[PDB]
Design a protein around this ligand. Structure first.
Ligand code: SF4
Ligand code: SF4
Ligand code: SF4
Lengths: 176, 75, 70, 175, 115, 74, 156, 215, 318
C-alpha cells in the first residue's frame, strides 16, 4: 500500500484558471495564512509563570540522588557495590569498612554528579532501596567542588525529606 | 495590592487551599488548565533573606513540593 | 485574547502623539497665536515681506488691524 | 555672521572632491563622492534651485551605488590604501588642500585673482534676483518643458537609452 | 540652514552617543577580541579578496532605468500646458520605450542568469 | 490560451492597451484644453485705446469679451 | 555619606540593568541544544525574562555551553569565547559539558569545560530539565544581584 | 551557526554566492562510543544507544534490543511488542515533527516551530509519565520492555491523537500549499533514482526520489 | 522655540523605538502561542529601558583591519539620516515646510542603504561582505519600483507638497483610485524597510546578521534604532501618503489622534506580516520583483497619466 503525491495536470477550465489568476493577483491564500495567524493570536497562551506556577512532573522522576534510612533506624545501605557494578559512567565510588560493631557498612560513598547520567540502574540494582533517585532538581552551583557528593552530604540530603521519597516509592513499588 | 502587582502578575486569589509554616501560601484551582491548578505565594523574610524580592525555588517544604509538581491530588 | 497587549500600544502611541501636539503648541506659541504663514512661492514670500515691513517691530504676525486707514 | 555661505559650501565641495579625484581606493573615493554630491546639492539648493539638486543627488548617488558594487566585485588589493597611507596619495591630497587654502588666502586678503579670469572676491548675493513677483517658479516650468516644446529631444534621448540597453546586453553576450 | 540646524543637532546627538559608548562604562582590555571571526575558525587571509559576482547586467539595468526615472519624474508639470497632444504622446512614447527595452532584455534572457 | 501564459503580465498588457486606445475616443480632452487655457498665471495686460475694435471690452464686467461660466454650470 | 550613597544607588541601577535581559548565544553542540530549543517552548518561556536568542557572539551576554565538547571543537569554542562584550558569563548546561559525564574518559573529550573557559553557573543533568535551566538562569541573575562593582571601585 | 542544525563544519570553496565546491567536515562531535562499548557490557552500554541518535529515543532502543534478541534466539511476549511498536510510531512522530521544525527554522518560518514544540512538550510529558525520563528514556531492556506503563496513559494517547490530527491539519492550513514557501523549495535537490540507489541513500530520500521501498 | 521643536522631534522617536521593541517581543509572543515579557518591571516597560542601559554598558571595541574612520562614521550617518528623514512629515504642521518631500524620502532612504553598505564593508570579516552585497542586490531591486509607484500616486493629486496632499485627502482616500498600485507599494516598503523576511535577506539564519557580524557591542543600539525608525518612518509615510482623515480645521489634536491610531495599527499589521512567513531568495527576488511588478507598474503609470486626460482630472498644481 503506497499513496504517492504531487501528480496533477492543472485543470484548464475557465473557472479554474480565473480562480487561480485571482489567487495570483490578490495573494488570496496568503491572506488565509494571515487569518490563521489571527486565529492563534486571539487564543490564550499555555505558559507557566516560573517560580509561582511550577510545571508538572511524574512519580518516577529522577533527581537529587538521596539516601533512605530505616523506619526508626540506621543507614539502609550495606555497601554491596551493585550500584558501582551497574553504574555505567563509574560515578559510584564505594570503599567499605565494617563499623565499630561488626556489621558491614561503608566509609567512602561517592556519587560523582558531574558523571551521573540519571538512568536508575542504581535504583534497580539496590537490593534494599537504599540509594533512591531524588525528586527535585536544584544543584545549580557556582562552584565545581559542591557538585561531587559524599556520605554525610547524601545523608543530610536524605534527612531533608523522607516522606517525599516514601510517597513516591509507595506509588511506584508495584511497577518497578 | 502592590505586593502582588509587583510580585509577578496575578490577581487570582479565590480558591484558598491553605498555607504552611514559613507562612507560604498554596492555592489549588480547577477552573484553569492543567499547569495552573496549584500556585504558590512566597512570603517575606522566611529565613531572614528578604525573600519578597529575589525569590528562590525550594523555599517550599517538601510535602508541598510533591503536591505542587502535580504528583498527587490532595494537599 | 489581546487584553494585555493594549497598554504597550497605548503608551507607545502617546509617545507618537506628543510630537504632533507639541509641534502645534510651539507653532501657536511662536507667532502670537497665529497658525504659521507657510510660504510656498515668491509671491507669498513677497506678500509676507511687505506684511513684516508694515508692522514696525519687524514681526509680520502683528498685522496692524484696520487702523492705518488714516 | 556668515554671508559667504555658497562660497563656503563650495570650499567644502572642493575639499571633498579633490580628495575624491586624488584616487584612493574607490570605496573611499565613493565616500568622497557622496559627501561631494551632498554638499553640491546643498550649493545648488541654497542658491535658489528648487528640486534639481535633490534630483541629481538621487540619480548620481544611485550611480555611485552601482560603482561600489563593481569595485567590490572586480578587483581590490591585498590591503586597500586610504588617503594617508602612501607617498603619492598623501602628497596629492595635501597639495590639493594647499591649493584650496592658498586660493582662500589670496581671495580673503586680496582684491581679485586672475589665473584664467578676473574673479571677483565677494559672495554671490550679487548678482541676484531683485524679488520678481513670479509665482510661475522658473524651474518647475523649465522642467515642464521637454514635453510641450521638447519634441525631438526626448526622442533621441530615449532612443539613446534603448540603444544603450541593447549595447550592454550584446557586449556581455558577445562571448 | 534650518535643516542644517537639524543636521547639526543630530550630529551632536550621534557624537554624544559615540562618547557615551566609549568613555563612560568600563575598561578596554584588547589583544584577542580584535581577531577576525567568521564562524569559529581562523580563516585564510581576510576580505578584499577578488569576489567575482553573479549579476552583471542587473546593476547597469538599474542604472539605465533610474535614468529613465529621471526623464519621467516631471509628470505633474507635464500635465498643465495647452499642448495636450504632445504631452500625452511623448509620455506614452517614453513609458513604451522603457517597456520595449525591458521586453527585449526579458525575451533575450538578460535576467535569467545568476540573478 | 492567450490569457494565462503569464497572467498578471497579460493583465498589465490589457490595461496598457486600453490606456493606449482610450484617449482617442475622449469627450473631455476639449474640456481639459479649455480649463487649462483659461487659468491665467500672469497679468492680462491692457492695450492701446483702439482703432475702434468692437471687441476686447472696455470693462471686464461687460460680457463682450471671452468670459467663462461653465465651471459652476457642469 | 552622600558620595557612597550615590555610588550604591548607581551600582544597584547598573546591576539591575545587567540582570534584566541576559540574551545568550545559541551555541548548542548536542542534545542539550534540543533541551535549549524546548526551553524556547511556549510552556516554558524565556522571553518573559529577556533571554532572547541572538546568534552573533559579539553581542551575546552569556554563553550556554551545551553538548559534548571535544578536542576538535575546543579551539573553536574558546576562539568564540574570547571575543565578546567585556562582561561575560558561562552557563555550563549538562553532564557532558560540566565534568565530562558519560564520555569522561575516551579520547577527544575535554574532561569538562572547566579546562577551557571560566565557568560560573553549572546546571547538571542528562539532560537538565528546562525548569532546572531556568532556575540556573535565575541564580545567574542573583549572582548579578551581588556584584558590588562600583562600591568596590569607589572604596578602592 | 544557527542554520547548521547541531554542528557541521562546512568548507565551501565557492564562486560568489553561486558556489564551486563544498566539503562537510564532521567529526567535531566525536565521542569514542564504539571503543567505549568495546570496554563495557551490554546493559551498561545501552544508554550509548539512547544517546547516539538523540531524537529517536525509542526507535534505536528497539533496534538494539531486537539486535540482541535476533542474536540470542528469544521472542519477547506480544504485549511488549505492541507497546514497543506504539512508542516506535510515537517517536517516529516526534522525529518527523523535528524534521519539519528544523526545516522551518532553516527556511525562515518562525512560528510553527513554537506550535509544534508545544505539541512536543506534550510528547515529553508522555515520556515522563511512562519512563520517568525527560528525553533519554532507556526503557527497552534487551529481553522485552521493563517497568511498564501505569493506569492513565492510553486515555492521554487517545485524546492527544485527536488533538494532534487537528494540529497537523492546522499546519497544513498555515504552510503546505503556501505560495512563497513552495516557490522557495520545489526545484532543488533532485537526485536521480539510479544514483539514489548507488549513493547509499535510504529512507526518506528513496521515498521522495523514485523507488518504492519500505523495510 | 525652534530648538524646542527639534527636541520634541528627537525625544519621542527614542521612546517610539524602545517601546516598539517591546511591542515586537510581546505581539510576537502572543502570535507564537506563548507569552511575552511579563515579569520584569511594570508589565514589560522598564526592561526595554534596561536594554538601552544594558547595551550602553557593553564597552564597544574594534576588529583587526577595519579602518576606524569609515568604521565609526557608518552607523553615525545611519542614525543621523534616519532622524533627518522625519523633517517634512506633516504631523499637522511639519518642521520644515518643504516644497518637495517624497523625492527627499527616496534620497534619505538610499542614504540609509549606504549606511548599511559602509558598515558591511568596514566591518571586514567576509560575512559582512556577503550581507552587504545582498543589501546591494535588494536595493538594485527596490529603488526603481517604489520611486515609479510614488510618481504615479503623486501624479493624480500630490504634486510633491504634503500639505496639498492632506488637502486632497478629504472626499475619498487615495486607496480607492489606486488599490493594486498601493499593494505593490506596500510590498516595496516592506522590502526597502528591510524588516519582515518575507522581503528581507539580511538578518537571515543562513547568515549571522550580515549587517552586524562584528561591528561593535556599543553601536548595535544605533543600527537597531535606525532600522526600527525606518519601520515607523515608512509606516507614517504610508499613513500620510494614501489615506487618513479630513482633519478638524485649525485644530490639531483630533487629526493627531486619528493619524497615530491609523499609523500604529498599520505598523502592527506590518509586524504581524513579519511574524508569519518564511524567508526569501536572491534570484527569486530579482525574478519576482522585475518580472512581476515592473510592467504592471508601467501600466498603472500610463493609465494614471491618461486618466487626467480621460476624465479631466488634471491637478490644480501650484
Ligand atoms: S546497591 Fe544499594 S545497598 Fe548496594 S552498595 Fe549501592 S547503595 Fe549500598
Ligand atoms: S543514575 Fe546511572 S549514572 Fe547516576 S549513579 Fe545511578 S547508575 Fe550511576
Ligand atoms: S548531557 Fe545528556 S542531554 Fe546533554 S548533550 Fe550530553 S548526552 Fe545530550
Amino acid at each position: 500500500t503506497y499513496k504517492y503525491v504531487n501528480l496533477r495536470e492543472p485543470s484548464m477550465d475557465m473557472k479554474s484558471v480565473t480562480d487561480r489568476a485571482a489567487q495570483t493577483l490578490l495573494w488570496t491564500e496568503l491572506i488565509r495564512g494571515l487569518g490563521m495567524t489571527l486565529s492563534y493570536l486571539f487564543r490564550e497562551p499555555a505558559t507557566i509563570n516560573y517560580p509561582f506556577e511550577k510545571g508538572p512532573l511524574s512519580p518516577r522522576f529522577r533527581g537529587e540522588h538521596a539516601l533512605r534510612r530505616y523506619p526508626s533506624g540506621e543507614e539502609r545501605c550495606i555497601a554491596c557495590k551493585l550500584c558501582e557494578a551497574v553504574c555505567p559512567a563509574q560515578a559510584i565510588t564505594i570503599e567499605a569498612e565494617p563499623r565499630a560493631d561488626g556489621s558491614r557498612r561503608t566509609t567512602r560513598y561517592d556519587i560523582d554528579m558531574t558523571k551521573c547520567i540519571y538512568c536508575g540502574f542504581c535504583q534497580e540494582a539496590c537490593p534494599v532501596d537504599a540509594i533512591v533517585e531524588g525528586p527535585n532538581f536544584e544543584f545549580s552551583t557556582e562552584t565545581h567542588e559542591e557538585l561531587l557528593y559524599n556520605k554525610e552530604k547524601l545523608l543530610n540530603n536524605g534527612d531533608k525529606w523522607e516522606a517525599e521519597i516514601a510517597a513516591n516509592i509507595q506509588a511506584d513499588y508495584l511497577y518497578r | 495590592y502592590l505586593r502582588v502587582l509587583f510580585r509577578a502578575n496575578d490577581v487570582r486569589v479565590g480558591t484558598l487551599v491553605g498555607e504552611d509554616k514559613y507562612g507560604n501560601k498554596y492555592y489549588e484551582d480547577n477552573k484553569q488548565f492543567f499547569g495552573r491548578h496549584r500556585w504558590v505565594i512566597y512570603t517575606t523574610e522566611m529565613n531572614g533573606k528578604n525573600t519578597f524580592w529575589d525569590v528562590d525555588g525550594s523555599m517550599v517544604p517538601p510535602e508541598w513540593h510533591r503536591w505542587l509538581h502535580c504528583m498527587t491530588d490532595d494537599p | 485574547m489581546w487584553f494585555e497587549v493594549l497598554p504597550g500600544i497605548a503608551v507607545m502611541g502617546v509617545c507618537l502623539f506628543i510630537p504632533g501636539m507639541a509641534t502645534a503648541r510651539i507653532h501657536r506659541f511662536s507667532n502670537g497665536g497665529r497658525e504659521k504663514r507657510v510660504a510656498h512661492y515668491s509671491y507669498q514670500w513677497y506678500l509676507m515681506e511687505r506684511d513684516r515691513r508694515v508692522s514696525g517691530v519687524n514681526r509680520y504676525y502683528v498685522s496692524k488691524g484696520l487702523e492705518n486707514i488714516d | 555672521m556668515m554671508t559667504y555661505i555658497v562660497f563656503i559650501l563650495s570650499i567644502i565641495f572642493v575639499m571633498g572632491f579633490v580628495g575624491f579625484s586624488s584616487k584612493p581606493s574607490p570605496i573611499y573615493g565613493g565616500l568622497g563622492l557622496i559627501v561631494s554630491g551632498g554638499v553640491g546639492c546643498g550649493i545648488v539648493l541654497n542658491f535658489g534651485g528648487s528640486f534639481l539638486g535633490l534630483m541629481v543627488f538621487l540619480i548620481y548617488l544611485g550611480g555611485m551605488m552601482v560603482v561600489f558594487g563593481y569595485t567590490t566585485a572586480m578587483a581590490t588589493e591585498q590591503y586597500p590604501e586610504v588617503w594617508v597611507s602612501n607617498k603619492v596619495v598623501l602628497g596629492t591630497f595635501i597639495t590639493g588642500l594647499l591649493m584650496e587654502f592658498l586660493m582662500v588666502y589670496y581671495v580673503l586678503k586680496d582684491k581679485e585673482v586672475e589665473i584664467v579670469f578676473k574673479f571677483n572676491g565677494m559672495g554671490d548675493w550679487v548678482i541676484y534676483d531683485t524679488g520678481d513677483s513670479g509665482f510661475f517658479s522658473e524651474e518647475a516650468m523649465g522642467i515642464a518643458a521637454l514635453y510641450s516644446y521638447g519634441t525631438w529631444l526626448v526622442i533621441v534621448t530615449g532612443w539613446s537609452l534603448l540603444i544603450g540597453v541593447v549595447v550592454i546586453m550584446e557586449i556581455t553576450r558577445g562571448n | 540652514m534650518n535643516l542644517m540646524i537639524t543636521l547639526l543637532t543630530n550630529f551632536t546627538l550621534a557624537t554624544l552617543l559615540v562618547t557615551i559608548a566609549f568613555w563612560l562604562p568600563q575598561l578596554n582590555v584588547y589583544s584577542e577580541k580584535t581577531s577576525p571571526y567568521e564562524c569559529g575558525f581562523d580563516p585564510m587571509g581576510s576580505a578584499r579578496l577578488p569576489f567575482s559576482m553573479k549579476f552583471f547586467l542587473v546593476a547597469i539595468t538599474f542604472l539605465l532605468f533610474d535614468l529613465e526615472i529621471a526623464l519621467l519624474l516631471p509628470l505633474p508639470w507635464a500635465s498643465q500646458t495647452t499642448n495636450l497632444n504632445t504631452m500625452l504622446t511623448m509620455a506614452l512614447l517614453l513609458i513604451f520605450l522603457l517597456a520595449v527595452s525591458l521586453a527585449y532584455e526579458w525575451t533575450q534572457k538578460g535576467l535569467e542568469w545568476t540573478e | 490560451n492567450v490569457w494565462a501564459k503569464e497572467p498578471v503580465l497579460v493583465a498589465s498588457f490589457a490595461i496598457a492597451g486600453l490606456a493606449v486606445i482610450l484617449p482617442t475616443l475622449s469627450p473631455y480632452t476639449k474640456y481639459s484644453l479649455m480649463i487649462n487655457r483659461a487659468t491665467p498665471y500672469n497679468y492680462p495686460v491692457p492695450l492701446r485705446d483702439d482703432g475702434n475694435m468692437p471687441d476686447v471690452p472696455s470693462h471686464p464686467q461687460d460680457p463682450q469679451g471671452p468670459s467663462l461660466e461653465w465651471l459652476k454650470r457642469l | 555619606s552622600r558620595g557612597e550613597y550615590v555610588v550604591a544607588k548607581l551600582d544597584d541601577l547598573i546591576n539591575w540593568a545587567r540582570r534584566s535581559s541576559l540574551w545568550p548565544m545559541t551555541f548548542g553542540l548536542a542534545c542539550c541544544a534540543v533541551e535549549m530549543m524546548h526551553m524556547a517552548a511556549p510552556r516554558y518561556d524565556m522571553d518573559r525574562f529577556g533571554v532572547v536568542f541572538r546568534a552573533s557572539p559579539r553581542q551575546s551576554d552569556v554563553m550556554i555551553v551545551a553538548g559534548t565538547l571535544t578536542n576538535k571543537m575546543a579551539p573553536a569554542l574558546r576562539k568564540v569565547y574570547d571575543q565578546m562584550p567585556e562582561p561575560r558569563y558561562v552557563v555550563s548546561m549538562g553532564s557532558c559539558a560540566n565534568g565530562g559525564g558519560y564520555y569522561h574518559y575516551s579520547y577527544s573529550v575535554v574532561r569538562g569545560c572547566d579546562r577551557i573557559v571560566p565557568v560560573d553557573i553549572y546546571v547538571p543533568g542528562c539532560p537538565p530539565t528546562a525548569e532546572a535551566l531556568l532556575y540556573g538562569i535565575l541564580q545567574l541573575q542573583k549572582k548579578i544581584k551581588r556584584e558590588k562593582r562600583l562600591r568596590i571601585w569607589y572604596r578602592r | 551557526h544557527p542554520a547548521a542544525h547541531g554542528v557541521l563544519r562546512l568548507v565551501m570553496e565557492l564562486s560568489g554566492e553561486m558556489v564551486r565546491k563544498c566539503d562537510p567536515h564532521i567529526g567535531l562531535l566525536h565521542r569514542g562510543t564504539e571503543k567505549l562499548i568495546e570496554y563495557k557490557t551490554y546493559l551498561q552500554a545501552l544508554p550509548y544507544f539512547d544517546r547516539l541518535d538523540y531524537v529517536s529515543m525509542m526507535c534505536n532502543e528497539q533496534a538494539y534490543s531486537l539486535a540482541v534478541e535476533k542474536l540470542l534466539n528469544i521472542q519477547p511476549p506480544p504485549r511488549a511488542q505492541w507497546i514497543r511498536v506504539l512508542f516506535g510510531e510515537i517517536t517516529r512522530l516526534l522525529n518527523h515533527i523535528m524534521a519539519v521544525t528544523t526545516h522551518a527554522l532553516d527556511i525562515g518560518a518562525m512560528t510553527p516551530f513554537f506550535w509544534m514544540f508545544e505539541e512536543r512538550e506534550k510528547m515529553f510529558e508522555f515520556y515522563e509519565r511512562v519512563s520517568g525520563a525527560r528525553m533519554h528514556a532507556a526503557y527497552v531492556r534487551p529481553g522485552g520492555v521493563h517497568q511498564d506503563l501505569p493506569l492513565g496513559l492510553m486515555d492521554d494517547i487517545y485524546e492527544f491523537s485527536k488533538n494532534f490530527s487537528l494540529r497537523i491539519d492546522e499546519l497544513e492550513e498555515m504552510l503546505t500549499n503556501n505560495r512563497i514557501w513552495r516557490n522557495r523549495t520545489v526545484d532543488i535537490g533532485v537526485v536521480t533514482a539510479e544514483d539514489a540507489l548507488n549513493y547509499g541513500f535510504s529512507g526518506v530520500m528513496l521515498r521522495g526520489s523514485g523507488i518504492q521501498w519500505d523495510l | 522655540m525652534f530648538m524646542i521643536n527639534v527636541l520634541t522631534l528627537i525625544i519621542p522617536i527614542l521612546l517610539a523605538v524602545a517601546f516598539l521593541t517591546l511591542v515586537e517581543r510581546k505581539v510576537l509572543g502572543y502570535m507564537q502561542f506563548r507569552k511575552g515579557p511579563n515579569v520584569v518591571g511594570p508589565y514589560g516597560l522598564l526592561q526595554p529601558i534596561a536594554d538601552a542601559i544594558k547595551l550602553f554598558i557593553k564597552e564597544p571595541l574594534r576588529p583587526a583591519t577595519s579602518s576606524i574612520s569609515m568604521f565609526i562614521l557608518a552607523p553615525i550617518l545611519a542614525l543621523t539620516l534616519a532622524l533627518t528623514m522625519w523633517i517634512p512629515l506633516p504631523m499637522p504642521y511639519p518642521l520644515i515646510n518643504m516644497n518637495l518631500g517624497v523625492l527627499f524620502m527616496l534620497a534619505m532612504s538610499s542614504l540609509a542603504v549606504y549606511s548599511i553598505l559602509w558598515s558591511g564593508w568596514a566591518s571586514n570579516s567576509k560575512y559582512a561582505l556577503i550581507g552587504a552585497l545582498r543589501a546591494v542586490a535588494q536595493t538594485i531591486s527596490y529603488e526603481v519600483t517604489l520611486a515609479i509607484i510614488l510618481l504615479s500616486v503623486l501624479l493624480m493629486n500630490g504634486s510633491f507638497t504634503l500639505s496639498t496632499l492632506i488637502i486632497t485627502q478629504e472626499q475619498v482616500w487615495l486607496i480607492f483610485p489606486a488599490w493594486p498600485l498601493a499593494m505593490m507599494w506596500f510590498i516595496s516598503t516592506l522590502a526597502e524597510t528591510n524588516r519582515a523576511p518575507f522581503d528581507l535577506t539580511e538578518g537571515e539564519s543562513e547568515l549571522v546578521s550580515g549587517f552586524n557580524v562584528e561591528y561593535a557591542a556599543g553601536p548595535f543600539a544605533l543600527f537597531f534604532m535606525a532600522e526600527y525608525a525606518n519601520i515607523i518612518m515608512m509606516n507614517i509615510f504610508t499613513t500620510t501618503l494614501f489615506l487618513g482623515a479630513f482633519h478638524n480645521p485649525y485644530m490639531p489634536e483630533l487629526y493627531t489622534i486619528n493619524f497615530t491610531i491609523k499609523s500604529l495599527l498599520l505598523s502592527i499589521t506590518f509586524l504581524w506580516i513579519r511574524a508569519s512567513y518564511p524567508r526569501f531568495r536572491y534570484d527569486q527576488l530579482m525574478h519576482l520583483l522585475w518580472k512581476n511588478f515592473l510592467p504592471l507598474t508601467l501600466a498603472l503609470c500610463m493609465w494614471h497619466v491618461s486618466l487626467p486626460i480621460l476624465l479631466s482630472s488634471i491637478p490644480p498644481q501650484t
